[PDB]
Design a protein around this ligand. Structure first.
Ligand SMILES: CN[C@@H](C)C(=O)N[C@H](C(=O)N1C[C@H]2CCCN2C[C@H]1C(=O)N[C@@H]1CCOc2ccccc21)C1CCCCC1
Ligand SMILES: [Zn+2]
Length: 90
């Protein structure tokens, strides 16, 4: 988990990511996620939030904010305003 603080390190976890999942490693790693090595389960290096069952059209930053809105990495990258909006606070 400490070794997942860099984008390149998270990317390397996707070596055996199934090609049929309709979400790409690059999008996932950019949003703080790394592959835990089973099915399509990923976790955030910062908040330890886990996501799975990726769907066509999913945006990992939106999903991050939907489910883990207090994540500090998410807040620092996208800002509190983005998070509030995803949470339906205007
Ligand atoms: C459809 N888009 C995906 C990203 C999505 O919304 N996934 C949800 C999810 O990952 N969630 C849902 C939220 C609800 C409360 C917090 N949950 C976090 C996350 C989830 O299910 N994570 C599991 C929890 C058990 O531990 C792990 C470990 C690794 C990966 C995922 C999870 C799914 C899960 C499976 C069926 C449909 C919703
Ligand atoms: Zn997070």
């Amino acid at each position: 988990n400490l070794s997942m603080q860099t984008h390149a390190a998270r990317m390397r976890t996707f070596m055996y990511w199934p090609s049929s999942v309709p979400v790409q490693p690059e999008q996932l790693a950019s949003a703080g996620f790394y592959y835990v090595g089973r099915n399509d389960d990923v976790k955030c290096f910062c908040c330890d939030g886990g996501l799975r069952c990726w769907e066509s059209g999913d945006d990992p930053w939106v999903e991050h904010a939907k489910w883990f809105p207090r994540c500090e990495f998410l807040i620092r990258m996208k800002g509190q305003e983005f998070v509030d909006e995803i949470q339906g606070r205007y």
